[PDB]
């Protein structure tokens, strides 16, 4: 597909009796985090979290720092107003989350932009794909919608998503190309563990891959075993790569009827693996 995304993920959490709401922002290109900001840090500043962003000059870090400090203040006002929109007491903790950013194709052109929010883990309001209109979840989010229509917020969000977001993402891709535009294929193997005299687990492993998107399936006589496959969530290894496994319990003696199928961007072609007892 050759596509890429940039996302910023903000979390604001109120804590009555324990100060002002904490603000945390992290920024990603695809599955790679590259910046953070945390209002509880000793001297809150945007900080680098990937090597290829370190080259940006002091004006970058200074300007972005001022932006996050403004965003925290805006989120604190938002939290106060949300409490009122839901008739909530001032004693409980609440959470405001924001996602925004852009997706581009191989040619660098905008595929889609995003700007949306959740309150207490529930979708609240979202900029529509047109980057002009809003979808509100309920009557509280309709108040936000009215305010943001009157202030022409969507026009500004569109300008960022079509302009700055795309342009900076292209720069990041070009500065981090050796990693950001490199798919590392999974290293794969199948293990076998008897569970009883009559059954064994076959586990299909994928290790060391980037980006995180992968499909691991088991087939029995070429039929997908969707309902009988234990699949773990794809998980970070801590060295930029991801891991995943898929397991099926099979009748002893029938192992050879099972195949593990692996698809990933980094592979020249999809893999079919079987248990090979050495």
């Amino acid at each position: 597909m050759g596509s890429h995304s940039m996302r910023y993920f903000h979390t604001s959490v109120s804590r009555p009796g324990r100060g002002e709401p904490r603000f945390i922002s992290v920024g990603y290109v695809d599955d790679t985090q590259f910046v953070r900001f945390d209002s509880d840090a000793a001297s809150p500043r945007e900080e680098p979290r990937a090597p290829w962003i370190e080259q940006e000059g002091p004006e970058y870090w200074d300007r972005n720092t001022q932006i996050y400090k403004a965003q925290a203040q805006t989120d604190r006002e938002s939290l106060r107003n949300l409490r009122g929109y839901y008739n909530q007491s001032e004693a409980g903790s609440h959470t405001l989350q924001s996602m925004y950013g852009c997706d581009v194709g191989p040619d660098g052109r905008l595929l889609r932009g995003h700007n949306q929010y959740a309150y207490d883990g529930k979708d609240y309001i979202a900029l529509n794909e047109d980057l002009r209109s809003w979808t509100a979840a309920d009557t509280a989010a309709q108040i936000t919608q009215r305010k943001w229509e009157a202030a022409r917020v969507a026009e500004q969000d569109r300008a960022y998503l079509e302009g700055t977001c795309v342009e900076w993402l292209r720069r990041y891709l070009e500065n981090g190309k050796d990693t950001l535009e490199r798919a590392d294929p999974p290293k794969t193997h199948v293990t076998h563990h008897p569970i009883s005299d009559h059954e064994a687990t076959l586990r299909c492993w994928a290790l060391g891959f980037y980006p995180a998107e992968i499909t691991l399936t088991w087939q029995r006589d070429g039929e997908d075993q969707t309902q009988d496959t234990e699949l773990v969530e794809t998980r970070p290894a801590g060295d930029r790569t991801f891991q995943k496994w898929a397991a099926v319990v099979v009748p002893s003696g029938e192992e050879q009827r099972y195949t593990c199928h692996v698809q990933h961007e980094g592979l020249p072609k999809p893999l079919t693996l079987r248990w090979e007892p050495s």
């Binding site: 922002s25 949300l82 609240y124 202030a151």
Partner: peptide
């Protein structure tokens, strides 16, 4: 780079 905030909720 992040977007300048605009209006609270």
């Amino acid at each position: 780079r992040p977007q300048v905030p605009l209006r609270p909720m």
